[PDB]
Amino acid sequence: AVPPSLRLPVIEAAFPRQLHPYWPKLQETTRTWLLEKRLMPADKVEEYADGLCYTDLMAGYYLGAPDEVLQAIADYSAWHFVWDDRHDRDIVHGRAGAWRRLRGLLHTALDSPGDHLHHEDTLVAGFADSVRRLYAFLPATWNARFARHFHTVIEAYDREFHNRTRGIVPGVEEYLELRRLTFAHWIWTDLLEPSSGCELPDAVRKHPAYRRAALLSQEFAAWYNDLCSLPKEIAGDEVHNLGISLITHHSLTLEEAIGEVRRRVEECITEFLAVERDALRFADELADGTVRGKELSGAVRANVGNMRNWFSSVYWFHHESGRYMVDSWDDRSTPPYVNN
Ligand SMILES: CC[N+](CC)(CC)Cc1ccccc1
Ligand SMILES: O=P([O-])([O-])O
Ligand SMILES: [Mg+2]
Numbered sequence: 001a002v003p004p005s006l007r008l009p010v011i012e013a014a015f016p017r018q019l020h021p022y023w024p025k026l027q028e029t030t031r032t033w034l035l036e037k038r039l040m041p042a043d044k045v046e047e048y049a050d051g052l053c054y055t056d057l058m059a060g061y062y063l064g065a066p067d068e069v070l071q072a073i074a075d076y077s078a079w080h081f082v083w084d085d086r087h088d089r090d091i092v093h094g095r096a097g098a099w100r101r102l103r104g105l106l107h108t109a110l111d112s113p114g115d116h117l118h119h120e121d122t123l124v125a126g127f128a129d130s131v132r133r134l135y136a137f138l139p140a141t142w143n144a145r146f147a148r149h150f151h152t153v154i155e156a157y158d159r160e161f162h163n164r165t166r167g168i169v170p171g172v173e174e175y176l177e178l179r180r181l182t183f184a185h186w187i188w189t190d191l192l193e194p195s196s197g198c199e200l201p202d203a204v205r206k207h208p209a210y211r212r213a214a215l216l217s218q219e220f221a222a223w224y225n226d227l228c229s230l231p232k233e234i235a236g237d238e239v240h241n242l243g244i245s246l247i248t249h250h251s252l253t254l255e256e257a258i259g260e261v262r263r264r265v266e267e268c269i270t271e272f273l274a275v276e277r278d279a280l281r282f283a284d285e286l287a288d289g290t291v292r293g294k295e296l297s298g299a300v301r302a303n304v305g306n307m308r309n310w311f312s313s314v315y316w317f318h319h320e321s322g323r324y325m326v327d328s329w330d331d332r333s334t335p336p337y338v339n340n
């Protein structure tokens, strides 16, 4: 029962949700990883980890992924949620120095994860572990692309630190550009490829239909998160949210802003449906009677399929995850699962 202001009938009707068969073991294994990597307090893992639905989110996304690939992705993704929490806490505590140091360590670990597997900062060591494993699936050219994209993500998180420390709410267009980095659009897009077991040639993944399908999948996800995470974000003095940018700089009321975000979210869906058709047509063109062509076709098809799955996985994640249930918290400004 999704609340009216959050409900999207098109997703519920035309985007049936999927579940990777490895999910039952995935949920257990990632939880054990969080504990052993000491990324969250043991009591908070016990009480909140399963209810956070982080593994569910990934298992509803990267369908067809080899089990060990899904495991590395799930561990990374859970880590990223914890990083977002650490980032938030450093901000509210004014820990500029601690953040700067972490920021610098993540950059270095990104290029040389093996060196950071046992760093004193458990967050850094956990990052390096998931990254080292992700670097073991595809050629070095894919690893370099992943690294390049993530360096940009880290710097986007630093810009967020800058903004919140100074009390700046980004303009609408400024936010939209920034959001493609803080949501890590291109990381999720990169991870499509190890999931289907094929590093795509540039001419394939930069095909206008593949590019646009990939973009719309991520825009929907980020903006829908903005819609659903808005209550807890307002309560927690978060400034990064399309709704917040609209209220601040466009003189919109909360109701009007929510409506504007909804419309932009809804447009992603129908625009995706159009481009999805073009992307699948491209997939057909790739199937040229050669083994290589069959391979590229199957990969693009699997990838576009997962771009579609992201819609439904993200939609239901926000309904199920304990991460956004601010009304159930003792202190609305302080989520119970974060280390304060
Ligand atoms: C902060 C959480 N996350 C993923 C770890 C960072 C990019 C974005 C996200 C939120 C909600 C659903 C999906 C992704
Ligand atoms: O980053 P990119 O390679 O363009 O995707
Ligand atoms: Mg964030």
Ligand SMILES: [Mg+2]
Binding pocket: 084
């Ligand atoms: Mg956040």
Ligand SMILES: [Mg+2]
Binding pocket: 225, 226, 229, 230, 233
């Ligand atoms: Mg959010």
